């Protein structure tokens, strides 16, 4: 299966530099052109740059808005594409996707996209989250299903990644959009499991906050 995995986003001040990486698997990376595409609420999807093959001297082309500031490059031995950004501005904020260009020489459509990595250009400071477990008021008074929660408070910037049991518990999960107040975000995540799993088994909330390089694991205890 084809897979593209971006990494490297975080928060940078205006004027700052940041390098994004994208590791590919499931195909011969060397035979395909690669692109970087970005997405923001205000501009929608924007093609940023592309890069061709070793026999084309890795030729690159850029959108005008990034030309001279950003560099797309690749390392075929690592099956990776990169985006080195300098002199970053508030309008460079968004989710950056690496994409594979279709194989046929004149088909430029982008047939596989990574999950994206978030870039925030801001002068505000990074603030790690506090993470609180949310157990029901009673563990002995149940129904056939039990819902548990996790409160991820007072962080900046977005995003945070919430998972349950390291991603093993994936069905019945609702992670709500964060709400911004006094320059800090707060979000909650709920997970609904059969009554037979909790409290008889351990359930853990896992929070990652990429910008502060923080991971917090909190067991939901009665």
């Amino acid at each position: 299966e084809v897979n593209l995995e971006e990494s490297g986003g975080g928060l940078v001040q205006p004027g700052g530099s940041m390098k994004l990486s994208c590791v590919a698997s499931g195909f011969t990376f060397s035979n395909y052109w690669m692109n970087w595409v970005r997405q923001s609420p205000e501009k929608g999807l924007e093609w940023v740059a592309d890069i061709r093959l070793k026999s084309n001297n890795y030729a690159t082309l850029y959108a005008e808005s990034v030309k001279g500031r950003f560099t797309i490059s690749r390392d075929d031995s690592k099956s990776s594409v990169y985006l080195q950004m300098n002199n970053l501005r508030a309008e460079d904020t968004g989710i950056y996707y690496c994409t594979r260009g279709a194989y046929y020489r004149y088909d430029y459509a982008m047939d596989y996209w990574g999950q994206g990595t978030s870039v925030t250009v801001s002068s505000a400071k990074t603030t790690p989250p506090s993470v609180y477990p949310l157990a029901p008021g009673s563990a002995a008074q149940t129904n056939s299903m039990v819902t548990l929660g996790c409160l991820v408070k007072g962080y900046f910037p977005e995003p945070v990644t919430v998972t349950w049991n390291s991603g093993s518990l994936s069905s019945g999960v609702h992670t709500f959009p964060a709400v911004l107040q006094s320059d800090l975000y707060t979000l909650s995540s709920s997970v609904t499991v059969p009554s037979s799993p909790r409290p008889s088994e351990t359930v853990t909330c896992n929070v990652a906050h990429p910008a502060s390089s923080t991971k917090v694991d909190k067991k939901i205890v009665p």
């Binding site: 990574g114 609180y132 409160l151 909650s188």
Partner: protein, 220 residues
């Protein structure tokens, strides 16, 4: 640069209906020599990256259902969904690749209409660890309901309705088209500790009674 325009900006339809959405370019996307239109359609389901649906204006990518059909030529293109399914919930984008820079339209957001559904409500007292920091967030989850506009009411000490609440709705679900929502009442620990009963009530313009969930601090 080629400017791409899409219409409508959003559409709401029930499962089984036909949808039509258009994409216009500021100049032709055709190459006369090969008679191909250099136009792609992407689908972006909630919480996911865009996925290639169609390229060369009407060729489907592997895995794409034949309910999706791309058509049109030159400057005017159409994406039709013959019979919409709940899993088609998404923003649809067109993109020209006739010329650099490659450019995208602003998207058509497809929303799904479905039968009313009552929420599953769960209420949680503030975490005891949160109380160590002096804050008390009482949380209520209203899961898998429809339509989107639901009313959440907080009461402190049995029917004194309260308001320093923050509410947050998910996107529509890809499978069942419902919404879920978190309602969070944050007080100081001292104010939280002056009252006994905390209740979260969900209503939606009905003669039907609210779904009510509560807890009492005196269970300790």
């Amino acid at each position: 640069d080629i400017v791409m325009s899409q219409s409508p900006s959003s559409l709401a339809v029930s499962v089984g209906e036909k949808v039509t959405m258009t994409c216009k370019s500021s100049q032709s996307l055709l190459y006369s020599s090969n008679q191909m239109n250099y136009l792609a359609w992407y689908q972006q389901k909630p919480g996911q990256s865009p996925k290639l649906l169609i390229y060369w204006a009407s060729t489907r990518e592997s895995g794409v259902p034949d309910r999706f059909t791309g058509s049109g030529s030159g400057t005017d293109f159409t994406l039709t969904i013959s019979s919409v399914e709940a899993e088609d919930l998404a923003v649809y984008y067109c993109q020209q690749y006739h010329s650099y820079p490659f450019t995208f339209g602003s998207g058509t957001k497809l929303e799904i209409k479905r039968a009313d559904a009552a929420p599953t409500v769960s209420i949680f007292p503030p975490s005891s660890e949160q109380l160590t920091s002096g804050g008390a967030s009482v949380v209520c989850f209203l899961n898998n309901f429809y339509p989107k506009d639901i009313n959440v009411k907080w009461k402190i000490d049995g029917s004194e309705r309260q308001n320093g609440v923050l509410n947050s709705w998910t996107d529509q679900d890809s499978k069942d088209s419902t919404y879920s929502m978190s309602s969070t009442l944050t007080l100081t620990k001292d104010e939280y500790e002056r009252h006994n009963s905390y209740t979260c009530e969900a209503t939606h313009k009905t003669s039907t009674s609210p779904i009510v969930k509560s807890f009492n601090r005196n269970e300790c």
